[PDB]
Write a protein that binds this ligand. Structure first.
Ligand SMILES: *Cc1c(COP(=O)(O)O)cnc(C)c1O
Ligand SMILES: *Cc1c(COP(=O)(O)O)cnc(C)c1O
Lengths: 269, 277
């Protein structure tokens, strides 16, 4: 059964409630993380919690708990689930923005759900992305604002002025002439899956260019994939009307996915 | 009474008691639209236009309305009757717990906040306010969504602007909660609603300008045009017309609220009953 830790207690997820005075509800003031488990251990726990604090600070939210307290809650919750878990800690604005231009009455809660990996067919066939001419403002912040992600495709792709940055919940990688191309962290969220893939490429002597791949480059691309802690590496075979390479998951993508899964122990906490 | 209220789950609650499930995608993913409705003489201003805009925002966001507009109107009127004072009414439509395989939010929730109105301080109308320009735009600009994060983090840097101003590539569109008007040579300039939210205060001001034979240009005023401007103001149902005397480091005219701004504000308040429901 899904859980939510809020106000010092593990509740059944469906019973957990937040006051409508919270500025996460009224004004979208909130940041969060997605943490997933392998062998019931949290992957990149410390990197995720550091990113949460970074998101809060960038958003003028004063952390309502220490990272040590959040880590303790997360571990106890995963133990309570007794299955592979997706953990979603949320930091809210709370009820007011002070004259100091900070949110000082922040609330927090942590959702625990049974993990939902994409269907194995999506790894076999790969997925389609829908490009939009828009960017994430405050792109280093993992904020709760996903409206543009909803309003064919597995996921939207932020392509401001035809420069591919990233998906709504995913890092984007292009494969062109055996090179990895991915947006630099001046433009894209500092993905934990992204970090691991860059480390694996360095180990594989695979050249990485940290630049925004262009929509105009997609016809000369052999492969593409998106990354995130739940989806791992998910092949991308179509972006808008453009097929990627010959429309099936590519050799370098499947190799990096295999290496990812074989190596992931090193980053489990 | 005068205590703040929230209508949720068929009941008027004290505002402090109202809670929403954390499963709601308004909390998890920012999936929410809302309106700000205010009263004059305890009557809702532009109620029908606001409720039509709410349904427009919901529909544009793939949210299935969880109540009819007739039912939202009933709730809003009953709540204003309970406050028995000048009220700010905030109806919220939430995404609810799931985004279906039909790419709709079909289990939307709703609630309506009723608060004693808080008009800007009379000094802000006397002195006017400053705005902070950013090189960013509202996507889905016809939708009144709950996403205001940029409005707050954009006071992290900024020394004391009342509001951010979306000026993508130097083209002024609007504020985070306000329509923006420039006055140049006795004529009104304001972004077209292809780019800016269709403000209800904006609509009334254009109606007043049409009555006053005041020329309106529906184009984005440019940051580069501000040195040749006489006046500026921002509009919103609570703030009415609020003079703008500074945008970033640029003073507007001689830094005091202008003649045409005060005249339109006066005509607005003299005429307001026409738009009450
Ligand atoms: C969450 C997120 C990702 C993925 O980050 P991981 O740490 O790999 O799970 C990528 N991009 C965006 C915009 C995100 O919000
Ligand atoms: C709500 C809002 C306004 C003001 O609308 P009114 O109907 O005049 O109250 C203006 N611009 C934006 C972006 C808004 O969200």
């Amino acid at each position: 059964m899904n859980l939510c830790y809020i106000d010092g207690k593990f509740l059944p997820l469906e019973e957990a409630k937040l006051p409508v005075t919270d500025l996460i509800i009224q004004r979208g003031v909130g940041v969060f993380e997605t943490i997933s488990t392998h062998s019931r251990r949290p992957l990149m726990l410390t990197p995720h919690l550091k990113r949460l604090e970074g998101s809060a600070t960038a958003s003028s939210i004063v952390m309502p708990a220490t990272l040590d307290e959040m880590a303790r809650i997360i571990r106890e919750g995963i133990k309570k689930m007794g299955c592979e878990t997706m953990v979603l800690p949320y930091i809210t604005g709370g009820d007011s923005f002070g004259k100091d231009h900070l949110f000082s009455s922040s609330r927090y809660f942590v959702i625990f759900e049974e993990i939902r990996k994409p269907d194995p067919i999506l790894y076999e066939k790969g997925v389609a992305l829908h490009p939009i001419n828009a960017e994430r403002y405050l792109p280093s912040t993992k904020s709760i604002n996903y409206m543009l992600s909803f309003t064919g495709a597995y996921e939207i792709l932020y392509c401001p002025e035809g420069e591919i940055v990233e998906g709504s919940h995913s890092t984007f990688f292009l494969i062109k002439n055996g090179h990895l191309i991915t947006a630099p962290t001046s433009r894209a969220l500092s993905g934990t899956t992204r970090q691991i893939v860059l480390e694996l490429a360095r180990r594989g002597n695979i050249q990485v260019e940290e630049r925004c791949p262009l929509l105009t480059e997609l016809p000369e691309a052999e492969e593409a994939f998106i990354t995130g802690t739940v989806k791992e590496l998910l092949p991308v075979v179509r972006i808008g009307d453009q097929i990627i390479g010959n429309g099936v998951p590519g050799k370098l993508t499947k190799h990096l996915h295999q290496v990812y899964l074989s190596s992931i122990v090193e980053w489990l906490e």
